[model samples]
Structures are given as C-alpha cells and as structure tokens.
Target: KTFKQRRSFEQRVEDVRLIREQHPTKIPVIIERYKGEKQLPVLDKTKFLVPDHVNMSELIKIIRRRLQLNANQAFFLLVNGHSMVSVSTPISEVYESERDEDGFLYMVYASQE
Candidate 1:
C-alpha cells in the first residue's frame, strides 16, 4: 500500500500536472502529523500552495504561529528522513529536490523534548 491508494498514481500525477500548470509560481505541499504520539494539536488544514519564493523559516514560523503552542515548547518540521535542520533554504529549492514523484512536498510536524 502506498500514499493515496484510493487515488493512486494516475490521479496524483494528473493532480500535480494540473496544479503545476495552473499555478507555476506556487509549490504544492502536503503536511501531516507524526504518528508516534499525540502532542501537538491536529492541523485541520492539509495542503498548501506555498509561494516559491518563501523560505523554510518563514513557512515554519507561519505554521507554528497559527498552532498556538506553548511559549517554551518547540516543534520541528521534518521531511526526507527528518532533514531541514537549517531554515534558510528556499521552498523552490526544497521542492526541486525533496518533492515526491507526484510532484508535491510532504512534511510532518513532530513535537518532542
């Protein structure tokens, strides 16, 4: 079983094709919660059409801002085996390298001490 088995390769490929065609300036992104334990609140939102010019730090900052987490506790955004320790990276660069075969970036938010 793979991602979106209900909507497999053809559907995802087509989805990306249309999205990329229509919104060339934006990067398609999918955000998910970590599976281990429930620490952070669920993100009702899933997909993002992030601006290509946006940097990782800005992306992360915005997400956590809306999350309303504790002032001291912090969360990390993970991708591609938990990389992205650095935040200055651009969304476009990450998209080009880390994007899925269907052409969308997938990220998971993890909270730990």
Candidate 2:
C-alpha cells in the first residue's frame, strides 16, 4: 500500500523512510534517531504532506514560514505530550527539531499512528 493507506506504525515508518530515499532531493532528517520513543517516524497529519511524502524543498519552506524560523534554523519540532495541554497556553506547540539536552530530536507525533 501507498503511504496514504498505511495504518500501522511500522508500515508508516517504513513508508516514510522509503519516501525519503525515493525522493530525489533527499532532505537531511533522521527517521529512527530517537531509539527509546515508542513509535517510529511517521507523517500522522491528515494533510498527507510531510517531509517524507511531500516535496522536501516545499515542505521546508512551509515549515519555515509556519514556525517563523529562518534558513539557519531549518529544523522544526512537532511538540507532543500532555505538558502543553491547555488551549489558552501561548507556549510553542511546535519547536525546532534540534537535539535536546538529551540529544534527541523531539519531533513528536500528537496522536497514535
């Protein structure tokens, strides 16, 4: 099945890596970096247009715009967890996908894959 039809976490992760490899541009993002985390790297959004599936160059531009980030800060984060659960909270829902103090790129997928 295509990436769109993938439901299992493992399948999605495999598809994601395949998409990244198949794409000509080959944007530099690690898929299985965080070893301890439960799920594999996945494009869990309904948009069906993430770095793995969408045009890397275009997605990069969109991410930069959405996060108010510059080219230097190319890495963007998809924050998860119940820590920032409040609707009114003005904290960053997304963050730069940089190595945290623990050296993991915490690009979180909000829901179950």
Candidate 3:
C-alpha cells in the first residue's frame, strides 16, 4: 500500500511519528558534540541579537508566584548587546547564544556567516 505525502509541519511530524510507531525497533537518539565552531563565522555584529522574546506578563505571573522575581521587578529586554556600552569599538547585533553540534545551547557571541 502507498502512503499519502505530507505538506505542513504538523503533518510532517505526524508522519514521522506514525513511521516510528510502525518501527518499534528504532529509538530516538540524542547527540552530544561536534567538531568546529558552534556559531556563524562573521565579525560584524549588527542587527542580529534578540533578547527576552517571551511574553513577560505571563512569565512574571509564574515568576512572582514561584518567588523568583517580583512582578514589579520583572523586566524585558527588547534586544541584547554590550557593544553599545563599549568604550573602544562600537558594535551591534550581538548574538547572545550559540548551539552545539546537536544544536544544543552552547555559548554566546557574534560571527560572520
């Protein structure tokens, strides 16, 4: 029998889930490492960084309830960077995070792509 083709992201995920269900012998794998730099290899740091993109009002509700941060103290950063406050070279678009080989949270910085 033939299977129907997929078009949407949810459909693709469901297709893969169905395939996995049929293939019980296959297990999900998690990779830990890789060779080479984890971020884009560029020097220009302008218009690339985004900070605190989450909805903080909801976040603060949880945070304040959890006693981590007061709702009034909760703050959001529109974009993140230290280049502006630098004394020597003025830079922008600072990347605040990096991913590892398996695309896990790695480090922080900017690079040329």
Candidate 4:
C-alpha cells in the first residue's frame, strides 16, 4: 500500500500542517516504486524533506545513489501516474501545482529500459 493509503486523511493534513510550520521552506514528498517495474530496487525510504529549490535532476541523483544504480540504468520519476515533472523546474513550483489535497507531494519511480 502507498503511504497515504496507510495514513488517515486527517493525520495527513495534520502532519503536513505541523511540518510546514516547523520547516516552511522544505517540501514534503512521498515516493513509491511503480508496480510495473521489473528491474529497479524499491527505495528504502518513502518520505523526503527536500529543499524547496532542488530540481528533479538533483533529487534523482540522490535517489539513484540510494538505489546504487549505475549511470546507464534507466530510471524515471512520474507524478499522478503518467505525468512527468521537468528536471529543470524547481520542486517548489511542482509542489505548488501538484501537491496532494492533504499537502504532500506524490511521486513514483520506475526503471524501464
């Protein structure tokens, strides 16, 4: 199950509110492995407190290191299913437009070569 699925809607709202108050500039993000993925390892972590200005490319580099994948390995992150965020765009803008109703940003990753 996804993190949001396991969490109550009220709790999600409360957590987002509380964290934002404490860390106003950080963006809360939830990431999951794409179910159709066959080669990528699941990320050990589902939650991240990302710097507001960090772009997708930077975050992907960190995730790739966490997964210990080689440079040639195929990896991609998608939001709300099929939509992919641009690597050049700041995550803050993404959060502004794509954050969930409860306020956490949602994303999924897959390795398809």
Best by TM-score, which number? Answer: 4
* Residue range with the least summed lDDT across 10 consecutive positions in model 1: 1-10
TM-scores for every candidate against the unseen true structure:
0.86, 0.25, 0.19, 0.90
In what order do the candidates fall by lDDT, top score first? 4, 1, 2, 3
Best by lDDT: 4
Question: What does candidate 2's lDDT look like per residue over 28-107, in tens digits?
Answer: 23221123434333432332223323433344355445545445542423433223223232222222333233221234
What lDDT does each candidate get? 0.79, 0.35, 0.27, 0.85
Off by over 4 Å in 2: 1-6, 24-47, 50-78, 81-113
Model 1 misplaced stretches (Cα beyond 4 Å): 1-6
RMSD (CA, Å), each prediction: 2.2, 13.2, 17.5, 1.5
lDDT of 1 by residue, 10-97 (tens): 8778877888899989988877777773778877677778899989999988788768877776688887546685689899998888
lDDT by residue for model 4 (1-113), tens: 87978999999988899889998999998889988898999887888888998888888898899899998899888875555647888888888888889988888888762
TM-score for predicted model 4 compared with the true structure? 0.90
Off by over 4 Å in 3: 1-6, 27-113
CA shift of 88, model 4, Å: 0.5
Please provide, for model 3 over 4-110, each residue's C-alpha lDDT reduced to its tens digit, 9 standing for 90 to 100: 12144465455446645665333211111112334323222211121223332433233234334343442222212122232222111121222222211222232
